Amino acid sequence: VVGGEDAKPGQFPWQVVLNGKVDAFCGGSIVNEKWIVTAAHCVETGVKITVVAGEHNIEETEHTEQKRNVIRIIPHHNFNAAINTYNHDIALLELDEPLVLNSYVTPICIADKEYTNIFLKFGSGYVSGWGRVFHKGRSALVLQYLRVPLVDRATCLRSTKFTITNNMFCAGFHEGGRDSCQGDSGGPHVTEVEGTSFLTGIISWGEECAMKGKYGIYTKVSRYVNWIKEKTKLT
Partner 1 sequence: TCNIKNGRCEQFCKNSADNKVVCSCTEGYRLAENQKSCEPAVPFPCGRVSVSQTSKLTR
What positions carry a catalytic annotation? 41, 89, 185
Report CA torsion sign: 180, 186, 189, 194: negative
| 62 contact, one of partner 1, Ca ion, none, CB 5-8 Å limit per kind | Ca ion
Q: State which H helix or E strand residue 192 sits in.
A: strand 188-193
- Among 48, 9, 53, smallest CA distance to 31 is for 53
The answer to the question of residue 124 lying near partner 1 (CB under 8 A) is: no
Ligand-binding annotation for 62, yes or no, is yes
Residues 26-85 that bind Ca ion (CB under 5 A): 57, 60, 62
Report the residue number, 60 or 112, with the smaller CB distance to Ca ion.
60
Binding segment for partner 1 among 42-50, 111-119, 139-147, 178-186 (CB under 8 A)?
Answer: 111-119
Q: What is the C-alpha to C-alpha distance for residues 184 and 127, in angstroms, rounded to an integer?
A: 9
Q: State which H helix or E strand residue 225 sits in.
A: helix 225-231
- Among 180, 189, 172, smallest CA distance to 139 is for 180
The answer to the question of residue 9 lying near partner 1 (CB under 8 A) is: yes
Binding residue positions for Ca(2+): 55, 57, 60, 62, 65
Site of interaction with partner 1 (CB under 8 A): 8-11, 13-14, 101-112, 115, 192-198
